[model samples]
Target chain A: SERHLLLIYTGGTLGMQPGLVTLLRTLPMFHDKEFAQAQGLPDHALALPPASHGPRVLYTVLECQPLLDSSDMTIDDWIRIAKIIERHYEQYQGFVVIHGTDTMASGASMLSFMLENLHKPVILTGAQVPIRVLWNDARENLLGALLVAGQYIIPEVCLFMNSQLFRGNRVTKVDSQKFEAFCSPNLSPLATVGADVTIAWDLVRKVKWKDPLVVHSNMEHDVALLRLYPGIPASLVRAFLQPPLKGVVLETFGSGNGPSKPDLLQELRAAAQRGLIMVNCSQCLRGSVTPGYATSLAGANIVSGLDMTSEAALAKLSYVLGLPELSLERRQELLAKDLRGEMTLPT
Target chain B: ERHLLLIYTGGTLGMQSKGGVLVPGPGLVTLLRTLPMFHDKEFAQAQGLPDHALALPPASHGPRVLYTVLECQPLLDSSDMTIDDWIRIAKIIERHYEQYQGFVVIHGTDTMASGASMLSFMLENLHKPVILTGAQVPIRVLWNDARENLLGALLVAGQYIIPEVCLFMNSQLFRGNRVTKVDSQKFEAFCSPNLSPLATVGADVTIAWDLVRKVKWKDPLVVHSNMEHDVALLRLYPGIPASLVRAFLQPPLKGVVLETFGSGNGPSKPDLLQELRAAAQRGLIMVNCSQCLRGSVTPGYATSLAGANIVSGLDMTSEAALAKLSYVLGLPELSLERRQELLAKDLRGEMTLPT
Candidate 1:
C-alpha cells in the first residue's frame, strides 16, 4: 500500500537558520509571486502545478531522532540509522539518506556492508554548501538521489554525489577541498548522472541471494592504524601493541618493507606471538609485498598483510570477530581466502 | 687467471649405465677429469699444482679454462627439496661465492618454478651467474641433450656472460622469477609465458643485453629465510555456495588467492557477499585475480568490485600470486597501505599493463 520516497535527514548545513538581513534581501527567491514578478513573468504563469506524470504517492520525510552534525558521527549513530532502516525497510521501495560529507565514505562503506540482501537502492548523499545558498549543490544531490532511488531497481547500496553513483564500498573521499570529493579507485561507477542518469550495466554487480536478507549488528572497535616509518622506536610500537586490541594495520614502505633492525623485528615478532593480528600494508600507493626479499623483510611482519589493504584488512578482522563460531585459525584462514572480491593473490 | 668450481647436482640427464642395470653413474665427472681439450696438459705438467688451487694459466689451458667438479654430497631428488634444503644450498653458495666465478644448479621440473622464485627472493646482490639447467630425458639414451645443457650452462658461467639467477631449460634461458613449466613430458618443458626470457640457447647462448641484473657487487647478500606457508588458491565458478567458501576460509590460512571471471567478476549472492564482507571485516585478506587469462579488475564496476573495496588484487598470475602471498605473510612489519601499494604496483614485470 506504500510507495513513498523517504528522505531520511540528519542535521547538516542545509537546515541552518537564515540570517534576518539576508532573508529579506533574498526574499524574491523565497516568495513564488515576488520571484516571478522579478523575472518579468505574470504571477500565475510562474507557478508550477503538479502534472499527470505517473501514478504518484506523496514522500514521507523524517529527520534523525537526535539531529547530529556529520562530524559527530560514531558507531552508535550508525547502529541507530541501521535500526531505522530495519524498521521501515518493508514500507518503502527506496530511500535517500542525507548525511555530512566529512565521514561520508566511512558511513557509506558501513551501510553498504551492513544492509544484507538489499533488493532496492539506498542512495546516500550530501553537499558542501547549505541549501539556502544561491549556488548550493545540495538541491541537485538531493533531487538526483531521490529520482534515481525512486525509478531504478538497483539491488545494492550506493552513494550519489557530484552527479555520480558509486558502489558504496568502493568509494573513498579523495578530495576535501573540491566539489568532486569522492572516488572509487578500485572499481567503476555503477551509474553516472549527466543530462540523464546513465547506468553502466556492464559495471553493476548482479545480486545473487542464497537466502533472505540478514542484518549483522556487531562491529569491533579495538582496531588501530599504525604507519611504519624509518627508525620508529620500539616504545611507540609497544604502546600501540597493548592488550585488548583486536587488530593492527601496519603501513610499511616500498613493497611492504620496513626497517630491518633487530629490535624492530623482535617487537613485531613478540606481538604476533602474543596473538595480535598484525597486517602489513605498504605505504606506497602501488606495489606488492615480496616478503622473502631482503628489502621487504627489514621493517615489519610481511606475511600478516599478504597483499591486502588497510581498509579490507580491518573490515575482514571486524567481520571475523563478529562471527560466534570463528576461531583464531579460522580467522587466519578467512584472511587468506578471497571472499567478497577483496584482494587478488599473486602467482 | 680464471678459476671455476663446477658443482654437479644429479638429475636424470647426469646418469649413465654402470652395469646392465642403469644406475647413477660417474661418466660425466670422469669425462671432465680426463678431457685434455678442456685443460692444457703441457701447462699442467709445468705449473703442476700451482699455489692457487685449480688455477689454469691462459695459454696452457687453451684460452678458456675448466675446474674440477665437486660432486655435491649425493644428488637430491628435486621433488623432495624443501625450504631447509634451499637454506643448505644457499649456505654452500654463500661459502663459495667469492671463490668461484659462476654457479650451476641442476634440478627437476616439477618444483623448479617454486625453487626459482624462492631463490630469487633469497639471494641478494647476486652479481655472478647462478644458472639452473636440466634435461627432460636421461643421458643414458643415444639421442639425449644433457651435454648441450651442461655445456651451455658452463659457457655462461665460465665467461660470467649473464648476471642474475636464471633457469636454462629446453634451450631457453629465463630469469629465475619469470620461468614456469608448461609441459610435463615434452623435452621443451619450460616457458616464461607471460614475460620474455633473459636469454635464448642456440648455436651460442645470446643474452638479452637489457635484461641482465644491474646491481653492485659490494652490497652484502642478505637471506630471507622465513616464509608463510598457510595460503590457498580458490577459483570462482558459477553457483558456488557460501558453505564451500566458508570451508576454504575456515582456519590456519594467512592469505587467499581468488581466481574470478572476466576482469575479476564473481557471484554477488548476498549470503556469499555477506560471508566475504564478514571475512574481510575480520582482517582476512582476499586477493582477487581474474580467472580469464587476460583482463584486470578495475574500480567502480560490478558488485564484486564493491565487495573487494577494502582489499583488491589486480592482474597477477596464480604462480606469482602464491609466491607473493607467501613472501608478504613472512615479513614481520607489513602495513595495510604498504600491502595495498605493493598489490597495485608492478614488481619484476609480474603484471602486464592495462592497455
Candidate 2:
C-alpha cells in the first residue's frame, strides 16, 4: 500500500562526521525534501534520491536517542530497536539500519531473532571510512540498502556491504582494513551488488503471513559465556557456572572437543544437575558443531550448537530462557531448533 | 638457469583406457612433445615442427628450463596410496633435491590432498618448490583441466620462488596441508577454506604476496625419514559405539585424531571420556580437528571435555592433522608434553591457531 522506507541510524562510520555531528538535523534536508522536490514525483518525494527500481524509496528517519557505537549495544538496546520497528510496522514498506562494523554481526543477529516474522527487508549497512571522506565506502552501502529495501520483498534481515548482500545472521566481519571487509564464510552470499544487482532469488527464504505480526520483547539478559582453552582450570569453570547463570555457551576446539579431564567433567555434571543449560559451539569462523561422535565429551546436559555462531547461540538461548511460561524441556528443544534462520540443524 | 623434474607418478592425467574405464597409460612425455602451449616457436619455425622440450615465455626470472621425467611402475591411484607410496615419493625428491629447481608430482584427485600433506611433513626444511597437480578429466577430452593444471604448476615452479610445497589445481595455488578435495564432479576440485590461497589465476595471475611464506636459503634441506604409522582416525557422529572408540585408541596406537563437529564437540558420554582420558594419560597424543572443510578447534565450548589432554588441531584439514600427528610422534627423545605442544603449534603454516 506504501512506498516508504524507515532509516534507523544506530550510529556507525556511515553517518559519522568529524565534528560532534549535527547529521540528524541535516539528513532530512538533503534526503527527505531536496531529492523529492527535484524529482517529478514530489508527492512520493522522500521515497528515494536515486531510484533503481519502481516504487521510489521514500524514507523517514528514526534516529536513536544518544547515537550508539554498535559495540556498546546490550539486550536493552536490541529490545529498544525491536520496539521502534514494531511501533512503525505499518507506516513503512521496509527498514534500514546504519550501524558500526565492530558488532554489526551481533546486533544484526539479535535483531533477526527479536523480529519473529519479518516480511520486508530489514537491511543493515555501514562503511569503514567516514561518510565525509571522498574515498569513503558509506555512500554505496547506504544507496544499496535503500535499493534492496525499496524494490524487493526479501522478507529477512540482511547485511549489505562491499559488493555483496548477505543473510544478516550468516555474515562475519573477516577483514578490518579493506572495503570488501565482510564474508559469509559458511554460507554463500544472498546477492551481489555492483554494475548489476544480481539476486540469488532461489536461496532467499520465503514465508507467508500465516499469523499476526509478532515482536518478542522479553530477553534473558544474563547468560554466562566461556571459550574453552587448553589446560582450562576447574576454578574458572566453577566461578562461571555459579548460581544466577541460567545457561552457558561453551566455545570448544575444532569440531567441538574438550579435555576429557575428570575434574572438568565433574563440574559440568554438577552444574547440569543444578538445572543450568549448556550449549556447545565451535570457535571456528565457519562450520557447525557436531558433538555426537567423541568419547571425550561423554558427560552432562551439553547440547550441540550446530553451525551457530557464538553470538546467535547466546541470543537464542536468552530468548528461549526468557520464556518463563515454557517448560525447561521445551526451552531446551527451542534452543536447538532453527528459529529465524539462525542455524541449520541436522535432519 | 633452471632445471625441472617431472615425477610422473601416474593417475588420471595421461591415462588412456582399460575395460572402458580410464587407467594410467604411458605417453605423458609424448603428449607434451606435441602441445603448442609448451614448444618454443623459434625452434619450431626453423624446423617446421615443435621441440620435445617446452619453452616458457620470456620474463626476467625465466631461463630455458630443461626437464626430465621418472614414471614409476604399476601407477598408483591416489585412493589406494599408503605410507609406502608417500615414503617413495619423498625419497625420490630427497635424492635429487639439489639438481632440480622445482618438482612437479602428477597425481590423481581422490587422495591428492592426502599425498601432498604427507610430502609437506616428510620433507623437512624444504626450500624448493614441490608442486602437486592433477586432472579431473583425462587429457583426451576436448575441454579438459589437465593442460591448465599442469601448465600453471610448471610456470609457477619455474619462474616464482614459492619455496614451500603447494597444490596447484583449478587455477589456484593452495598450501599443501591446508587444501582438501571438495568435489568429484566438477573441474574445480580442491579448496583451502581455512587458509587463503597464495595465488589466484584470472585474466592475469595475481599473487597474494603477503600470504606467501618466505624462504631462508641458509637452512640445509633434510628429509624427516621417521614417520610413525601407528595412528588411527575416528570420525564422530551421533550414536557412535563405545566399542569403536575403545578399539581405535588401543595399544600400539601412538596417536589418534578425532574428527569432531564444528569447532570439535563430540558425544559427551562417561564411557567415551573415560577411554580417551586413559589413553591420553598413558602418553597417547589425542588431537581434535573439525570434520568440516573449514574452521578451527577452539577450547571451552563447555566443561565437558575441559582439562582433557587432547590437543586442539586448530584450523587444519584432516589430511594435515593426520600427517602432523605422524611427524610429531616420530620425533625422537621428545616428552609427551613437548610432542603435544608441537602438535598444537603451526609448523610450516599447516594449521592456523585461533587468536
Candidate 3:
C-alpha cells in the first residue's frame, strides 16, 4: 500500500559549490559522507539509495546534465523536466521538482497549467540562499516540498517557498530582498510551514485520478508586456504593438484609465483587428478594467487579465499560444477562464 | 481683474419642452436674467451675490457680472457625451485658461463620471476653479433646484476660491473624478462614495483645501480625445463558460470588467478557465473587481490567487472601475504590464487596502 514519490532536481543554489564549474563538480558529492558531515548530520542522510520509508518510497531522478543556475534555464529545460514526469505519471503517486528561486514561480505557474489531469501533487521548491551557504532556506523548502508532495491527498501544482505552499498559478515573487519572496495576494496559501506545518484543507484543490496526465510541450514566447503611462505617444505604442507579435499586455492607468488619445486608440484597434491578442490590465493595483466609461473606446474586443500576476500572465499566454488551434475567440475564452487556479472569473 | 466663464451643455435633466420632445430651451438664460431683474436697477437688489463680483459689470463685466454662456454648438444629450466631448472641453479650458479665473460646466448625469474623469486627466495644470454642475430638476418648476446650482456655481466660479475640477449636485460638492450618480429617481442623486468631497457648499461654500490637487503648472495641458470602444464588463459568477466569456468578448469588446468572488476568486470549470486563458492570449484586458463592497482581490485567494498576472480591480467600486477602464482604454500609450503595475498602486485614492 506504499506510495512512490519521484524527486527531480533541475539544479539551483540548493546544490551548488563556490566556483564557476562548482555545481557540476559538487553535485555528485551530494551522495558523499563529507557532504553529510558538512551538514552536521549522520552519513546515512546522504546515502544514494535514500534509506527511508513510511507509506511512501522516495526515488531520485537526477538530470544527467549539469545542474543549471536557474538564471540560464529555458522553456526547453522545463519541457525536458515535464516530459520525464509525464513518462512516469502512473508509476508514482506524487512528484517533487527542486528548482531555483529566481524563476520558480514562472515554471510552477506554467507547469500548473501545462500538465493536464494532474491528480497527484507536483510541488516545486528552492532556496533564497544557496544550500552551501550558512543558514540557508534550501533544506527546509526541499523538505517541505517533499513532505507535501509525498503525503498530501490534494492533486494540484504548488510552490513551496519560505515555508509556505502556494498554488503555483496563484503565487508571485513580491520581494527580491526578503526570505518571504513569494506571495499570492488574491488567494490564500494552501498550507504554511511555521513552527509546525499547518494545512488549510479547504484551500487545497482535488481532482479525479482516473485520467492519465497529459503533457503539453509547446509554448510561445512571442509575447510583450506594455505598461501604460500618462501622455504616452503613438510611435512608442506602435513599436511594441505592431504586426508579428503574438500578444500584448496593456497596463492602463488608475482604475485602468488612460489618456484616451485618438492616435493611441487607432493603434490598439488596428492591432486587435489584425488579430493580436491584446490584454487590458489596470495600472492601479486594486482596481480592474471595465467598459462603458466615457474614456474607453474599445468596447468589448480586448480581453481583461483579471487579478493575474505578470508571471502567470506570461505563462498562461505561452501555454495558450502553443495550443494547436489557437484562435482569437479561443484566446478570449481561455483568458477569462480559471485553468489550474490561474485566475477567477465573475460568477 | 476678476473673470468668470459659463458653459452650457444639453441634458434630460436640463431640457424643457420645445416641440413635444424635451429640448434645450432658454431656461438657464432666463433664470440668469431673473437674478438681476428681481430688483429695480438698485445695486443692493442683488446683494445675495458674493462680494467678489463687485469689480465686474452685472451685465457687461461690474458687481454680479453676467458673461455670455457658450452653449455647446450642437448641444449633445449628456448621455451621448463621449471621450471626444471631454477633450473638446479640455481644449476650451486650455484656450481660455488665461482669460478666465474660474469656469462652470453644465452636463448630464448618466455619463457624468466618464466626462469628469476624462477631463481630470486632460486638464492637469488647472490653477483656478473648474466646476461641473447640472440640475436633477429643470428650472421651469417652482421647486426646481436648478437656480441653486446656477447660483452656487456662479458664486464659486466668481470668486477663485476653489481649485481642481469638481462636481456640484444636490447641494453637495465632490471631486469630478470621484463623484458617481447612484440614483436615477431621487433629486439627491450623486455621491462621492469611494472618495471624499473636494468641497461642501452648505451655509457657506467650504473648500476642503487639503483634498485638492496642487496645480502642477509646469506641464503643458494635453488634450486626448480618442478612445477604444471595445471593452466589456463580465462579473465572475458560478458556472460560467468559455462561450459566455467569448460572447462577452465577441467582435467589439477590447476589455471586460470581471466582478470576481470575495478576494477576487472565480469558477474553475474547464470551459470558463480555458476561455480566460484564451482571452489573455488574444490580448483582451480582463480586470478583477471583487463582488464584495469592500476588500481587494489579492494573490492568495483560492479562486483567483493562481492567476496573478491578470489585471486586478483592487479596491475600486464598480463606478470607479467603469471610469478607470474607460480612461485607460482612451489613452493610447498604456501597455499591459504598466496597467497591471498601476492597478496595484494607489493613484488619486481610487483603491483601499487589500485585506
Candidate 4:
C-alpha cells in the first residue's frame, strides 16, 4: 500500500520568491518540483541516476499561509506546527517540514518533544540559497528531506541537510554561509545520502511500527535560555528567573560552568529554593554538564543536561514544566530523565 | 627538487614482533615496489613510472613523490619512545631540513601520537609537511589497513604543503598533537576527538585548504631539543584523594594537566583547590582540561576555585597539553601571565581555541 507525505513548506531561503535573488530574472521560470527534479550536481557538473521510484508514494504540499522568516519564529509558531501534525496524524506516513535555517533546530527540538511516541519521520530541512537560483542548495536539501521522510520509517524527528541526516534533537547549524550548515557534534549522523540513501542502522531508532501516534500540544512558554558569559550581569539573570518563570536552560561554559560571583550564586540559590528548575547545558558544541564545583553549583537547582543541545534542553524543560498533572519534584525528575530520546543520560 | 624523507622507526608495518621481539627491518622499500600498489596507474606516480604524472584539475595538482627512506639504526620499539627518541627524530629532520620538500615518519601505533606531538613543538617554524603514519596491522596481511594509511600519507605529503605536524591514518589527516589512540583493535585506531580533520582522503583527495597551517618559510628553522618529561596527567574521579593531586603539583613538578570533570570541574574539596592555587601562583602551569572525549575547559567558570589561577585546557588533548607545556617550560624567562597567554593561543595548530 502506498502512503502520502505532508510537505509543510514554511518560508526560508529555499522557498523564497525569484524577485529576491539579484540574478534570477535572466533565467527561465520553472515550477518547484520541475526545478528540484531537473537539478544537476553542480560541482561534479554531472547527473546522478534518477531516484528510483521504489517508495511508490506521492507527497502533498501544505504551504503555511504568508511565509514567515525563521528568526522571527517563536514558541507560538511551534505549537501551530505541532497541531498540523496532530490534526492529520493518521493521514500520512511521515511529514516533511521545510523551514528557515535560523530556528530550524529549535523547531525540530520542539516537535520532537511535542510529538509523543511518534512512529514516523518528521524531517526539518532548509537551504542557504534560493530555490530558483543557479546551483541553489534548496533542491538538494529538499530532495534529501523528501527522500528520507518518504522512504524510511526512521520514527525519530530528524534534520536532513547537506546530504547528512541527523536526529532533529541532536543537530545544530554550525555554518552561516556554507551548504554544509548543520553538525551533530555529540552524536554521529543517522544516515548519509549520496548515490545511495544509506542508513546507519546502529544510530537510528528502529522498531516495528505497531502503535498509534500521540501529539502532546502542551508547549509551555515561561522558559528562558540563559547563556553565560564572562561579564554577564547577575541582575540580568535574576530578573529573567523571577516568579512565573517555570524553567531555565542555563547555557554554561565548556562543560557546565558559570562565573562564581556571589551575586550570581545568591540569585541561583534563591531560584533553586523557590523551586525554579534550572538545567545546565554547555555552551561548547559538544559534551554534557556534570557537577564541576559543588559549592559554585550548590545554590543552583541545576540538573545535568548531558549531551543535549541548548535547543533540546529548552524544549525538554518547557515540555516537562508544562505538565500540570505531574508534581514539581516529579517534573524536576522528568527534566533529568531521557524522555523522547531528547538527551543522553550520563552513563 | 621534490622528495619525501621517510624516517622508518621500526613498527609492525614493515616487519614483525614475535612475543615482544621486534625484528630489525631492511626490505620495506623493496616490498613496496614489488606490490601492484606502487605500479597502480592512478594513485602511485613514483620515480620512473614510465608514465608522465597526469595533469590534474585546477587547485588539485596530482602527486608524484620521489621518496627516500632513512631507517633508524638499532631500531627502537614505539612503546619505549621517550623525549630522547623525539629529540633524535628532530635532529635527523634538521640535518636534512633543506633537502626534501616533505617528510614522513613510518612509526608504530602505540605511542606514535606522543612522538608526533613532541616533534610538532620541537621543530618550530616548520614550513613543510611532516606527516607521521603507521599500520595497526602489518602490511603483510592481505587487505590490511596500512595500504590506505600509507597510501594516503604519501599522497598527502607529496600533494600538499602544511607548515606543521600531522598524522595521516585511515584516509584522514589530523593535527599530530590533537589526535588520540582511541582504538587498539580496529584498523582506524586514531581519532581527533575534539577537532575536525584537516583533510579527508577518499576516491578523490579533498583537503580543507582554509584550515591548513600556512607555510612559515621566512622564519628560520629552530629545532629546540629541550623538553621536560616529569609532568603528570591526572584523570579525576569520585573519592580520589587530594594528596595524590598535591603530590603531582609539588616541587620538581614542572606542570600538571588535571583531566577535570565536565567543563573543568575539579572536586569541591578545599585541599585540592587551595594547593592548586598555590601551585599556579608558584610558576607551576596548572591546566584544567575536560575528561570528556570532546569539549574544551573553562577554568574560571562555575567552579568555586575561580580564584585558583588554573589555565583552561580549551579542548587540547592530554598529549598536546603535555607537549606544549614541555616546550613552554623550555622558553626564555617569562611571567606567569605570558605563559598562560601562550598556552591559550593556537601554537603550531595544536589546539582549537573556543571561539
Give the C-alpha miss distance for residue A53 in model 2, angstroms. Answer: 3.6
Question: If you score just chain A, what TM-score does every candidate get?
Answer: 0.77, 0.90, 0.83, 0.87
Best by TM-score: 2
Error of 2 at B182 (Å): 13
> How good is the docking of model 2, as DockQ?
0.03
- Candidate 4 lDDT over B285-306, as tens digits, reads 7677765556666556323443
Which segments of candidate 2 are over 4 A away from where they belong?
A18-47, A50-52, A194-201, A207-210, A293-300, B1-355
**In candidate 1, how many Å is residue A250 off?**
38
Q: What is the lDDT of every predicted structure here?
A: 0.60, 0.73, 0.63, 0.71
- The true-structure Cα RMSD of candidate 4 reads 15.9
Ranking by lDDT: 2, 4, 3, 1
Provide the lDDT at B120 for model 4. Answer: 96
Candidate 4 residue-wise lDDT, A1-347, digit = tens = 45567778777788775232222222223123333356531221111123576544455667787676674566777888888988877888888898887678878988889888788899999887887676888877876776778778898889999899998988776545568777887788989977777888887776546766666667778776665533334565566577667777776644454655667778888888788888888755656665642235444367878779878988898888888788776886887788866677766
Off by over 4 Å in 4: A1-347, B17-26, B39-63, B301-309
Poorest 10 consecutive residues by lDDT, candidate 3 chain A? A42-51
User: Candidate 3, B350: how far from true, in Å?
Assistant: 22
TM-scores of all candidate predictions against the true structure:
0.45, 0.54, 0.49, 0.49
The TM-score, computed over Cα atoms with residue i paired to residue i, of candidate 4 is 0.49
Looking at every candidate separately, what fraction of the true A–B Cα contacts under 8 Å does it contain? 0.00, 0.00, 0.00, 0.00
**Across residues A1-347, which tens digit of lDDT does each residue of candidate 3 receive?**
44556778787767675232233234442243443465464322222223234453344554536676554455677778788889888788788887866567767877876788888889988776777776878766766676677667668889888778898887755444357767676688999866676788886766855777788898775665565433445555665565557776665533333445578787777776776776666433232355322224443447777766655776777788778875667777887777777676655
